[model samples]
Target: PYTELLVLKAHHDIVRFLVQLDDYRFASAGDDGIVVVWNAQTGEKLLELNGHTQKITAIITFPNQLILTASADRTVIVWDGDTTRQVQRISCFQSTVKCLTVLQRLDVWLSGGNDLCVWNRKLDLLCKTSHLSDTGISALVEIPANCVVAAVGKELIIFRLVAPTEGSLAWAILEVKRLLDHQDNILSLINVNDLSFVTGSHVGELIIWDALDWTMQAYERNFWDISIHHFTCDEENVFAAVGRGLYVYSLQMKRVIACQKTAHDSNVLHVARLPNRQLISCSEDGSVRIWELQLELIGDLIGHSSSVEMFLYFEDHGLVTCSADHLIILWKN
Candidate 1:
């Protein structure tokens, strides 16, 4: 489904974040405190949005053509994707913001770190929760009922955002429930749909939860745990990046469909889906491979000088990948 189109260069260090802003445009943020916007179709460097003084931890595409970037400098920058300009910078943080998410239904956004912070479209500080813990939220995903799951350490804390709302009532982000299921720290979480979501711990504890009530639907635990990286799923199957392996689990069967135990030489950091029951995975070993769901290697691509941290598959437009080598490489359809 992909092959190298062009290698983009601008950053001085590793490119840690890659986000698709729209159908044809995307941006890559690097450890060198720089974010470069590019036109994915023409492979042309469009604009450079720079504000962070340190490395970026997370980058998310907010509603209405907005790009939100959080950095180790303890700030989040809101960027205007069209004008290629900085909209605002949020700096009132006690620690580095690790993850961010948007509740489009409520028109509010959230930042997670030592605490949880909620902001409106204007980036106003509507409400913030109490101090979470030493191990801040590693992942945040929006669930049903105006609630979100924060994977802080080994605990999955659920918080609801009540609107009409924060008039000195910092309870806007109210702590409603806590789920202590994984013995190890949670590393990955994603809301598969309105009905269910999934979480993977530092070890191989993969648990599925009911979205509305926050109860366990399925659990896969082990004594010799394999470190799971992240998960990407459709309605039918979930693709898991378990260390050097890639496991496809069926949601209906509630079992592993096919497990490529050693999909890569190093840890499979990211996994994504392609057309016709195909899957693609990038590893810390600096190689990307496409696999048929039936457990066959179809294609292998090696372009980055180091680890290919992440890749964005934009279907018709092209595929964009960022690496530890400080380069953003484009792959055509």
Candidate 2:
């Protein structure tokens, strides 16, 4: 079971993303082009920032004092969270960016949209490739030093990143070569370990990939025949979105363990695993549910005013949820 701590609001537009900055604080961004930081347990508003000139499409946390925000305005804004202001505005894009993934240790970050580009932390353009045809990218994941993956259009393409030994800034070199592709639109991906991983694709396809070759080795098909929107993977199983429902599949058996239809009554936009082997699922129904691995419903969390798009959790039992109602709520156990 769960209880409310407090509710903190942000811009008037829908909230689409949230990133936890450990136990006490976190950040959020959404439709209104504003990013709000919150104090988890106290529900206090810590700070506010504006980057995108139009509706913000996505946001992510980066190392140091940086935060990344993407927009329909065709740009990505890098903010210095400590200064509570914008530090850089990236306009090298030829299309709307849907998501951004960074491998700070590798000194690189990747962005996907109507166009695909990989850039450095300094906002310097590295490599720009046109891999997508008509459909835009929905999500992206970085495998660090060697690879990057994305859900572009109706397929998932794995690319190996290569950096030349010598070149100018114009040719400093970062290239991603496709390793494999899936038949469906990829929604999300998670690396389970070095050798195995999981992903959710359009049309209820859940595929597991082997790291050595980055190829789909096993998969599970669903009866609904609908696309999975979001998902996460663990060493044991992979959990994914199913309209207003939820589905869990075992990695060892390569089969579904349980399904929760109408799990949120709107759409389960995000599902994150907790340290306790329980999962916290949030939805457009303005609620969050925590369920155990055994498929036992533990409790429901209520506080947001609209749909929760994504969530991130960190130390101290602290969690963050972003909603379409333009708010980022933080909770601590």
Candidate 3:
């Protein structure tokens, strides 16, 4: 059993994203069109940010105390991470902003939806392209060397940046290659590094792709009828949120080593790794469960009345989770 340190009424609608601002502060954004900041140690509400007109789909914190959020209203709003004020709004996408990621060591960020857009820290649109997919862009991640990998419709799109020429501040984009492995829609993407990453599909396929060759390195199918909502990994193992359960795979053996057939009553929404090398998973069952590497359930936490959508964990603080009930809970030992 685990204890809940505090429960916060985070929003008026379903909470969709939870992220860490720093070691002691975390942020939660939801369908209520609001993002709230909280103190991780004290469980106190620090600030509430209001800007988006529709559901907040993605949230990312960058250098310079900036908080960026994308919404179903087809806009990306910039906020001051310290004061929690709306600073600027960028509305270029014709569809909902599905996902976003910041380029490492750069002042630019990439966002995906009906298309992909690159923007600077000041909300300046550098380039817009729909070359990845005509259907839509679901998820995107920055890889090594200013390149990006995105899940577009049923395929994976990789982009390589062309070196800027004389006197130009803009970067040119070249569509390197697109790989198609899964027959269904891609739901999530996570990187092991620049050369390797994992992707999950609506058909419950988990695939490891080699970035250099754009080929499948490893594969598994456990939830053939459902989605692999999220997954995380370390050097030793991969932990996946598969359907209503948790699935464990060994990187060395290249096979499933353990499984919790019913870790939750409903779909497990996300899985995260703790600094102590443990795993935590949140689910539509409205519960958060902690697990050891051997697939042992060590702790269970409950607070929200609806689906737990996302969670963030830091060593200095503890675990914080957001739910469809529009609440966030801080858990402590």
Candidate 4:
């Protein structure tokens, strides 16, 4: 019922995260502890980086080719993936940095671990948020309305930043809200506009709620109840990772419009919405599947030698993917 197309392969290692860059480039890091840079159009590898000693759990790319990667090694590596040079290594936590997200202005990023730190673009630590929990973070989000929220285990904490409007160098911070002990561990979150949101748990269920009142709008579950890992969506409906398949629920339908097995050869790591009604899914089988969301499948992604971990859709008809096989492949439709 929908159009589908097989885009391109990333040809990387066990890819963990994919980040869209400012300058027509994309970066990905994975279990190999290596970061791969791609052109985001030609499916060509621009650079292959090695700095971490263990698996890279997270990655984010910002303007100026600034790349940040977190790993099980208990350190965060800030490097210039495009220029192929080492920038700085930040290590101060007893445990690893579980996740990180930049502020609205993209000036500084707030990171979480056994201890959370707010660091400048130069990797200079500006502030610290003490860790009072034993569980590593499952997900994190920075809303556009000057709010920073993080998911640790089964709780969601909101922190408010009080910075001087003028020239004061000191910063004030306070905890404003806390949502504790949800049914299961919060696996993923998406900010819907400025007033609504959606969260996916490990139970193959999605919860759509109101941002202001914490009122539950919808709680939908799948029949098979597969373990969900990661999912992303636009301003409309929600997409979820269910076992080796992808499930799409319509916000308008308040129901699942389509359910299909994707990349059944291995565990599907992540999926993203592409242009048109088409969707893309990547798996540990070292392949990406392009599905029309109805007509079974159109084709498969054949490039990554190992597991593909994450992918992101860029502008100008481009997309990027990263794999544990240690590579980032770019594609332009």
Ranking by TM-score: 1, 3, 2, 4
In model 4, how large is the Cα lDDT of residue 326? 58
Q: How do the residues 1-333 of candidate 3 rate in per-residue lDDT, one tens digit apiece?
A: 446478877588988788888878888888898988888899888999988788888889877679989888888899988666789888766787888888866667888887788877777777878554567788887777667888877788898765457799777778888888878777778777566788877667778887667778888674333557777777656777877878877666878787876888888887766778778888886888888864788887877778988788767667778888878888776
User: Model 1 — which ten-residue stretch has the worst lDDT?
Assistant: 164-173
Cα-based lDDT at residue 116, candidate 2: 67
Candidate 2 stretches with Cα past 4 Å from truth are 130-132, 164-181, 223-227
Show the lowest summed lDDT stretch of 10 residues, model 3. 220-229
| Model 2 / residue 289 / CA error / Å | 1.5
lDDT of 2: 0.72
Instruction: Return the number of clashes found in candidate 2.
Output: 2
Per-residue accuracy of model 4 over 1-333 as CA lDDT, tens digit each:
212233334433456677766556666666768776766545556787788999887877645757788889988888875577878888776888888777857477877876557777767666777655688665667664466777877677776666555766565556677775467788887888767777777876677767766567877664234588777777776777677888777876687677776556777777777766678888877787777765368756677777776777766635566666656555454
- Provide the clashing-pair count of each candidate structure: 0, 2, 0, 13
Which sections of candidate 3 miss by over 4 Å?
1-4, 130-132, 221-227
Question: lDDT for every model?
Answer: 0.83, 0.72, 0.79, 0.70
TM per model?
A: 0.93, 0.87, 0.92, 0.84
Decide which is better by lDDT, 1 or 4.
Answer: 1
Model 1 lDDT, residue 42, Cα: 85
Candidate 4, superposed: residue stretches over 4 Å from native: 1-13, 42-44, 81-83, 165-167, 221-225, 261-263, 293-296, 303-306, 314-319, 325-333
RMSD of each candidate?
A: 2.2, 2.8, 2.2, 3.8
Better of 1 and 3 by lDDT: 1
